[PDB]
Ligand binder design. Structure first.
Ligand SMILES: O=C(Cc1ccccc1)Nc1nnc(N[C@@H]2CCN(c3nnc(NC(=O)Cc4ccccc4)s3)C2)s1
Ligand SMILES: O=C(Cc1ccccc1)Nc1nnc(N[C@@H]2CCN(c3nnc(NC(=O)Cc4ccccc4)s3)C2)s1
Lengths: 410, 410, 410, 410
């Protein structure tokens, strides 16, 4: 009694033959996209079958077997409800409601210190989800590209820890929040930036990645790596944002000279070059969708959930998630950790990279920022989400009052 | 047939009768203690039956059932390996190795600013575990009473949030680490103490509890509360420590007057009484074992694992777990959060209250402190614990390298 | 058949009955003594059986069985050559050659040092062997009482590590030898005595044992511990040696005051009293034979060989053997470790307590000392022993030139 | 019956023929490598058989006999579980766990001295095992070449004693640790370096080897010797490390001139030349794997375990193990001897040559050293190994508490 034929009877309902669209609809209903890279062989085979059998279109036990066999393990887990969120449909309806609520939150100011962010409508609002099992949902403007900006800080920190290890990286950068009123100070008392999520800390992390090669390869190396975290969905680049960011980055240069003088960099660092590399990494583009997959890779201990590819070490991902928890939301970091209790990173373009460990990754995007620099609708959404679901780090998985748990059912 | 007989033959193993000792030994190996409050009916019925047949002492099926039917759901759960740590006997052997490794860390200094702590041996060292299912383990000096000191701070903060709610409580006290810099200041910029885990914060929290009634009743109420938390295991009081603490609390009187002048207290507070109540709370005694149960209540969403009682609202436990993560280990809070990733609270007696959410609570106790004020062996044990098991809060449950996961049979 | 009968036939050579004396002669030849504590039940039963009849005395199978059934495991082991040295009769013959050869080393000088050792005569010379299986051999003056003097140092250090543990004991004393040039300093750079085998170290170890009771109770307690170690063989006390020790004790008082000033003792120490306790411990009396048992308890992982009792924890015995290796023979410790490769401890009375781990314990005793303070004859014998047998710690058990291995048969 | 046959039925299980892969799998599970030089005849015959029969490929009892006849003794020992560590599979699993435990110890600093050992990273960590029976296991970075450095000191001292005797060699060098730890001084009071494991002792030992010929012959001579100890596994040379060591050896030139002036060399010694030879010997290269075989030769009384060849005299190997005990780990020598109780030698590349007498040889390697100059990870591993197994010199083989003994089974 193979997997293939016993799953066959599940969708077969008791009939001899299965509608192709009935299979596809059932597949989608689990939250998997038909374009999922782990489902390619099966999708090619279904397409091929539609060609070679216009006499249909319905799958015999043996025909069904011939399509789904190469992707059979995934298809089972999907259809035997063993995914991290069993009732993904119900969950996405909740996501949509959360979305509609934050959509009514119209305040905040779009960043305008360079013309490439002043341009973005205040009304763009997008939310994407990717579970650690690759289940997907999106609502709103989730295919509009925007710059990562500071959302890239944890990503490049993760690359650094991955390539070099914790101990080395943290010779150069600390692992703690500054404390909300040592905002302005570049260095902690050990003459290290206090953590990798502040600009000074990010600038030093940037200086550690791929030492020795030029910025072109350095950038290519980081771009490859983001491609994998995103399961090869959209990772772009804004040159316009880069040119603007470098021509108006006085404080970043102020930080650059300070760090150099305090000898914060590895020997042989070309600081002005590192600053230029730093502006490039800030100008790297995503959509909500592709970024949600990056977040999911961090939710999934370093494996990209839609390719099954190991992208980062567990050590790299844990460190990163630790610091997004405590340092990722600027001056709202403590507030956020307290009330939302999720690892997250915001950016000046309006992105909030969000991780729900062992469940899912998200990217919420809306350009208007609050006084602290976080997307208004993103922050509102994040609070609501943890109000609804027992996703708070220190929520309990067995005793959680009236909170809903999307990891269960009846 | 039914649960009791189903269970009966499991322990029975083909033969007709079960010896009582063979049932008791079977039960212990699940990690439940025979004195478990939820197993009282069963043990009462065993004592009656061991009175009935000095003739015995076997148990046939209907007699076995007579003993266990009242506690059958718990006993089945225990015996069919449904507990949070299925192979607990393997897990305690790991705890024992961890224990012996920290035992070799003989450095640090016993607090001597008051004589009651000076007298404690630098060689006392105990660790106690209580899982969210009531499984128990201890190694070392675990029934020796010692004062909570600052380990009580999250307990009384939990009580305050439980009785009054988050929002009211945090009108008087903040929700963020000061961090590690700065760390002499009594108030943040909103003129609130930074958080509940610092002295200034604890003092203010102490003032919110059971307002209106006198300090004798307040202490009573908190004792009863700590009783529920410990599942009625050992909670006491060191009057000697109380006297020492109060004739040596210049700094907390300095804090008290500062807070009073800044109007940090609720209207109608007698600040000097509150400072007397706070010193009392610090002088409350526990053992490793009874404190590990309190920690398990926090691990278990507010339900005391060995009684089944709801002690704290889930709100209270979350808030508390949040602030123990970022603020619970003094100047080592950030390092500890980064490296151990567990909510914890230390005290100057050498206690470390440790919570592994959804898994277990622990108390570690060894009087010698490091220069930050944390128990040396406790700190070493805690690091090792998380080097071994995937208990770090930002460990992945599915992809965790070569860490051990005690929640699985692998 | 059964083991008693199997054993019977062995000792009965097909003959119908075993004479008692024949069984006794057969038993002695294994190396066991008839007075062996583990063989009491059997000897009690041979005494009773030899009372049943004026003469007799034969034992048929059921009578033999009657006497030997209580101790059959040990008797079988002895008779089927399972003892650590199978051909023990051959071995004692080579102990005797070694003895006679050292007997011709008449050089050296008795400690005139105190009024009690000056009368002890340079012709006395005895060597006793006790293996880890209780096999015994003696040659020369082995029942003559003499004081342990510094041979007591590993014994009292073992007691301390046994009662208090390694980490406590070594807060007070070190675990290395100093310079052969710094054999005059009392303290190392951490202001602890160098190790337990020097006077300053021994004095500090003496202060650790049974704190809180008077020194007459402390002395009793060490004597009790020393009784277990010798399997209740001779342990005494020389008041004479004690008096001359305490008057000629200027350097110990010098060390005493130096340790006091440098705060080397446990809090609440009466240094002057400790010196007096110390003088008593050095004046404790043994014979060659009883001391060899003490040495064999150390050879046997802390179990006394002729009684089976767990006398010392493995930690105690290992710690003790390690420090006898490097620190046990004064200025000759280095040369002795290199050439003899056995843990040993000498004393000014002429004694050398010798441990061959996993094989045997020995006491060698001969009052004339060389210019380093070690018994001339003892040192000569220890050299010859390791020249003859592959007992050196860094001899190879498989490839050992033309050395003899007593652990192996033909 | 013939051994070949008796062994045949073992693996035959009950069948008439043995599948070749099944014999190979059974062989390797003993820990023997198929590439073992003692198994060459058998492996050649098996390879030949696989050629001369495209059939099977299964061994008749007659065919099997033809393959394994010439190596029958060793194959018997291997299959009848008579190797020093019977359950090698279980042991290697324990090696791996110790490995993973030391792997999380990322402190220490790579030996920066004249930047080019700095070329390979602080992340390299490998452990290789070779038993005295030739059983092999490796984990981590064990085929990366690194320079012996000071790890070569015991090897060239063993060569010297082998060729010259103990008496000659120790006219020129001492037998003792410099004591507590002055290796400020080059000479002891007899104007001899203290022992062969200090640089002045190593330099003087170097001057002893192969006197009369030039340095290339001397070097070839020691290299062929190293080839035998390693069973002809990798022994190389780093010219890079040599030129470097040669231009950075002021201290060694300071020692060289001191020794010359104090007449420490043999008559006719060209000191500056000897220093150059000395630099070359430090620059000799091994892997973890080949070095483990060297250590195993020392563990096996001077016979290389994987060739059965006599490389060093028992006197040479004993002398070397005695001095590795007390003088092998720099300043940690006393502490290491106490806590680990194994002969070991560290080098500044991060290697630790470790001998467990009569059991196995090991090489641990991790470049980051501690303040004393010993590999952080190696030291951690060595401590953990002796905590786990009863391999400490002065562990007892019969009574050893909770330690595991891998020389045993049930
Ligand atoms: O803040 C204000 C006034 C203000 C108030 C309200 C609104 C607008 C302006 N002015 C500033 N001047 N300079 C600043 N930062 C420079 C650059 C980085 N830094 C250090 N980084 N690390 C250092 N080393 C340390 O140890 C930490 C430290 C510094 C000061 C006090 C305590 C600790 S200095 C020194 S900010
Ligand atoms: O100010 C705010 C609001 C705020 C917060 C953040 C940013 C802007 C405004 N709240 C508070 N002010 N003062 C407080 N505590 C009392 C008074 C000062 N103190 C000392 N702390 N430390 C003292 N001694 C020293 O700072 C040298 C020293 C340094 C190193 C080693 C030894 C001494 S006095 C004890 S709470």
């Amino acid at each position: 009694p193979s997997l293939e034929d016993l799953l066959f009877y599940t969708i077969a309902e008791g009939q001899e033959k299965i509608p192709v669209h009935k299979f596809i609809t059932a597949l989608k209903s689990t939250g998997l996209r038909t374009s999922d890279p782990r489902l390619k062989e099966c999708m090619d085979m279904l397409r091929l079958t539609l060609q070679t059998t216009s006499d249909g279109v319905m799958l015999d036990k043996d025909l069904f077997k011939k399509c789904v066999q190469s992707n059979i393990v995934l298809l089972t887990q999907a259809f035997r409800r063993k995914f991290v969120i069993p009732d993904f449909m119900s969950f996405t309806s909740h996501i949509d409601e959360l979305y509609e609520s934050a959509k009514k939150q119209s305040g905040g100011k779009v960043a305008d210190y360079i013309p490439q962010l002043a341009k973005f409508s205040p009304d763009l609002w997008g939310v994407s989800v990717c579970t650690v099992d690759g289940q997907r949902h999106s609502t709103g403007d989730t295919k509009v590209p925007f710059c990562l900006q500071s959302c890239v800080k944890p990503l490049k920190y993760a690359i650094a820890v991955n390539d070099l290890g914790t101990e080395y990286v943290h010779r150069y950068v600390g692992k703690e929040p500054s404390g909300l009123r040592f905002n302005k100070l570049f260095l902690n008392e050990d003459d290290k930036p206090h953590n990798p999520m502040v600009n000074a800390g990010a600038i030093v992390v940037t200086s550690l990645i791929k030492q020795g090669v030029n910025n072109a390869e350095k950038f290519d190396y980081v771009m490859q790596f983001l491609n994998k975290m995103a399961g090869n969905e959209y990772v772009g680049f804004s040159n316009a944002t880069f040119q603007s960011e470098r021509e108006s980055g006085d404080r970043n240069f102020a930080i650059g000279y300070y760090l150099k003088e305090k000898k914060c960099f590895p020997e042989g660092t070309d600081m002005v070059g590192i600053l230029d590399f730093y502006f490039q990494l800030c100008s790297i583009e995503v959509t909500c969708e592709s970024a949600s997959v990056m977040a999911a890779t961090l939710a999934n201990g370093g494996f990209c959930p839609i390719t099954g590819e190991r992208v980062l070490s567990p050590e790299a991902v844990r460190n990163t998630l630790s610091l997004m928890h405590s340092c990722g939301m600027y001056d709202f970091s403590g507030q956020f950790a307290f009330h939302v209790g999720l690892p997250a990173k915001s950016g000046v373009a309006g992105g909030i990279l969000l991780v729900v460990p062992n469940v899912m990754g998200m990217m919420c995007w809306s350009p208007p920022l609050d006084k602290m620099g976080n997307s208004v609708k993103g922050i509102h959404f994040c609070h609501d989400l943890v109000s609804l679901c027992n996703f708070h780090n220190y929520d309990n998985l067995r005793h959680f009052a009236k909170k809903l748990d999307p990891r269960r059912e009846g």
